[PDB]
Design a protein around this ligand. Structure first.
Ligand SMILES: N[C@@H](Cc1ccc(O)cc1)C(=O)O
Ligand SMILES: N[C@@H](Cc1ccc(O)cc1)C(=O)O
Ligand SMILES: [K+]
Ligand SMILES: [K+]
Ligand SMILES: [K+]
Ligand SMILES: [K+]
Lengths: 329, 329
């Protein structure tokens, strides 16, 4: 209530790939899994963040101890997306917006830990492990590890090479069993599995989501009803096409796991509303062309405005506007 | 007593190159120069260390505030010449041996500051400047800067790229006006002159010695009379050749600045002893072949045993043997 097998299924459902199944099952047989997710405090979170937030939700339902890392320094090291004062402001926008998302999807916040990188990444023992790690890692391996993650520019900065080793050490200093992120990470993840043990630390389990296409190709978490509508009307959803369909993906990765069902809103003329209890059923009806793109979008629009409603409320304070504007000028 | 002009001459004599003459003279017009020298606590110091020690001696005679940096972390980052426990032991061998050298040449120790890198290089603000610097420096520039200094290996380690930026930041954290080292450094020095100002810190004066050939091509600071003799008898000193002559170089860079003269020990049959008050005079007599290699070596041998005598005494304790043996097993 839940058994280790129900835990495993909740944690790993919808992932593209699990590294470390063997240790993962060892742990779940005995105790709760410790896991984190990291986000560099970079650009404004948009509705696509509900994809990783839905997995965090599943981790909590499974009994996991979840940490969220606001990787402020990593934002700095990644070709200075975020500068030195103006990192701290984005940290608070990210903390606020992320907690409102999770509240909105009904995730208990109370056993979720939020930490920011500069709470621990400038400490002496951490900094010492960074040098230690620098003495066994090649520029080659460090460069290879960040290829998909750090912005690739004409003359690579030294910070870009540091970035992967810090993300690996994060696993140890957050004292987790596992890290969850997108499949893009994978080379950083495999990097951490190889080098952490050279520092005498255990390799971690790694859980990778697919790169899920976006709803519009961005819809902002604070956008008005009216802009959600207009952004959706532009959204690309081809009749009968179940590949490369950001609308269907949003349903699969966010709306189904939320209530374990999805309601298509459809006029009586075409069958009336239908409630699907599994994604594969909706997909089949869409391929068969008995769910129209316009009905699919409207069913997502309704459900998405339900998600965004609280968030827009909370952030309808003048301090939060100050924060938003200050954070992104 | 000394004027700024006598100061400048003492500080810059025998150098191959001065960067920053303009600021250097500005400072000496008003106050004492702050300067350091750094040595990675790597292999056992040998008699060739008297070359940089003679310049440190001149810096003190000039009124300079001199810092000596025992760069323990740099020893680690430089392809792990020195490991983690066994760094600290070498630091104390280096501190002991260096102070005995300076005592031996009559340098007052009392206004010389000794510091080791790990006293300050793991601190938070230092570590933050390391990331800061990493965000403006390219792998390319950092790699280019260490080419002559860090051991170049088949697959370069990330630590090798860090090494130059740390040596630059050292200038700021030691609060010096200037750094003295060998000409090999030069690319690290020019690196520091370019990037320190991008962190909002001033560029420093840089003072570079030539790469002086060695006495035997090593003579250890603790070698017995008898091994100094045998090592010298092998030493290469071609008749009439004043280039590439480690014996003459040792005289020019160590023995002349020590007493401002040098005594050639020579039998009456060939003129008897002669006292030279300038290097250029000795050089001329050697080119002319009226100072023989065997007399040149014996004159150096005598003077060198005078240098090493105290040092061998001091280190004739069982703790110091313990230290030596422990440091180099
Ligand atoms: N690399 C992650 C962010 C992150 C940073 C540090 C970590 O420890 C973990 C994750 C991303 O691209 O989104
Ligand atoms: N690079 C110097 C050692 C050193 C290290 C750090 C410094 O800040 C200065 C000097 C050498 O090759 O001998
Ligand atoms: K981000
Ligand atoms: K990013
Ligand atoms: K050295
Ligand atoms: K060395």
């Amino acid at each position: 209530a839940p058994s280790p097998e129900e835990k495993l299924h909740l944690i790993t459902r919808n992932l593209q790939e699990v590294l470390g199944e063997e240790k993962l099952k060892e742990i779940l047989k005995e105790r709760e899994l410790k896991i984190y997710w990291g986000t560099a405090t970079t650009g404004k979170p948009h509705v696509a963040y509900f994809v990783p937030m839905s997995k965090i939700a599943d981790f909590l339902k499974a009994g996991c101890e979840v940490t969220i890392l606001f990787a402020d320094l990593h934002a700095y090291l990644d070709n200075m997306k975020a500068p030195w004062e103006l990192l701290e402001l984005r940290v608070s926008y990210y903390e606020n917006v992320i907690k409102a998302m999770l509240e909105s999807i009904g995730v208990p916040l109370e056993k979720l830990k939020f930490i920011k990188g500069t709470d621990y990444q400038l400490s002496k023992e951490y900094t010492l492990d960074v040098y230690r790690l620098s003495s066994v890692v090649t520029q080659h391996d460090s460069k290879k590890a960040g290829a998909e993650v750090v912005k690739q520019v004409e003359h690579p900065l030294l910070s870009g090479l540091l970035y992967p080793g810090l993300q690996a050490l994060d696993e140890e200093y957050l004292k987790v069993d596992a890290q969850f992120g997108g499949i893009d990470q994978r080379k950083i993840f495999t990097f951490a599995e190889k080098y952490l043990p050279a520092l005498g630390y255990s390799k971690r389990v790694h859980l990778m989501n697919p790169m899920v296409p976006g709803l519009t190709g961005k819809i902002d978490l604070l956008d008005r009803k009216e802009d959600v509508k207009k952004k959706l009307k532009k959204a690309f959803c081809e009749p009968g096409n179940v590949e490369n369909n950001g609308v269907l993906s949003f349903i699969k990765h966010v709306l189904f796991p939320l209530k374990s069902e999805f309601v298509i809103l459809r006029d009586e003329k075409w069958g009336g509303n239908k409630t699907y209890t599994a994604y594969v059923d909706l997909e089949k009806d869409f391929a068969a062309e008995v769910v129209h793109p316009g009905d699919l979008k409207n069913s997502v629009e309704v459900a998405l405005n339900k998600l965004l409603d609280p968030i827009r409320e909370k952030f309808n304070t003048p301090a939060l506007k100050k924060l938003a504007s200050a954070a992104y000028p």
